Structure formats: C-alpha cells, structure tokens
Amino acid sequence: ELRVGLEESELWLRFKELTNEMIVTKNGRRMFPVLKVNVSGLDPNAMYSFLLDFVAADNHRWKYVNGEWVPGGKPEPQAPSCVYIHPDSPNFGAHWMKAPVSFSKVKLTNKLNGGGQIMLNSLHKYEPRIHIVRVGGPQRMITSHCFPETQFIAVTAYQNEEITALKIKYN
C-alpha cells in the first residue's frame, strides 16, 4: 500500500495552532515551512511525476480583525489552483522513496505569471495537496493526498506577529 506522510508535522502544527500565513508577491515567494513528504510503497522500478496544488479550503475572503482571522460573509466559488511539477519529475519510485520529497522551489504569487509560480487569491485559506502520477507505464494512475496540518492563508504581509516570530525562529 502506497503510504504518504508529512515530514516535520511537529513544526507545521505549531504554525497551524496560530493560523498559518504564506506570503504571496507579484514575482512569487517560496514557502516556509517547505512541504516535505515521506512516500513508501511505490514500485522502485515504476516511473512517477509529483504534482502540488492548493485547494481553497472554503469559499470566503478572510481579514485579521482585532487580532483574529474572520471570514467575510460573501462566498464566491474558488477555481482550483494551477499545478506545480516537482522539478525532479519524472523519476523512478526508488528516487522518490530515498529521501523526503521537498517542494522548496515552488513560488506563490498573487498575479497570473510567466511560468513556475502558482497564483493564489490573497486572503483565501488553502490546503496543500499532492498528486502522484504513475507515467510511461500503459496504465496511467493518480494517487492524491491532502495535508490539513499545512493549511494557510495567503497574505501580502504577515498579520499575526506570532507567525512572523515562528517563521524567523525556525528558518
């Protein structure tokens, strides 16, 4: 059985219990913490591409009011985010299972942009999600996995200084 697990859940949970925030810029900003995933149960000899996308966790705009994150009242449908291909893709199962799969080079933006960067809507709450796509074989296969522990609100600057302080302490 294909097993997908979050590396450093300990750290992610400190961020989550404060409400995590991720900066988005016109040019694209890398994530901290970085999503790193432990994968076992692949065919070491099969081929796999690793994809990352961001699910809108709810349909609302959030705002930091009197030191607390609060949803707007006016939901709008959230079109799914674009997919980021792990730059090591494609590679053999053995490659993916030899060390944590680390999405250190994904950049989050607030503007439709050339390539690489993933455009998110500022002040929306997102749940990272990967897809493991078996490629080259005759039978194409997709396994998806969500990471609740890694939820964040996309922000153009940090609102909760407790987050600013954790980001610096652990970077």
Residues that bind ligand LJA (CB under 6 A): 49, 51, 83, 85, 89-90, 133, 135
Q: Which of 124, 132, 170 is nearest to 151 (CA)?
A: 124
Q: What is the DSSP track for 95-151?
A: HHHHS-EE-TT-EEESS--SSSPEE--TT-EEEEEEEEEEESSSS-EEEEEE-GGG-
Q: How far is the CB of 135 from ligand LJA (least distance, A)?
A: 5
CB nearer ligand LJA, residue 18 or residue 142: 142
Smaller CB distance to ligand LJA: residue 82 or 146? 82
CA 32 to chain centre: 10
Shortest reach from residue 118's CB to ligand LJA, in Å: 12
Considering beta carbons, is residue 46 or 85 the nearer one to ligand LJA?
85
Least Cβ distance, residue 95 to ligand LJA (angstroms): 12
Helix (H) or strand (E) holding 165: helix 161-170
| Residue 60 or 86 having the CB closest to ligand LJA | 86
Closest CB 36 distance from ligand LJA, rounded Å = 19
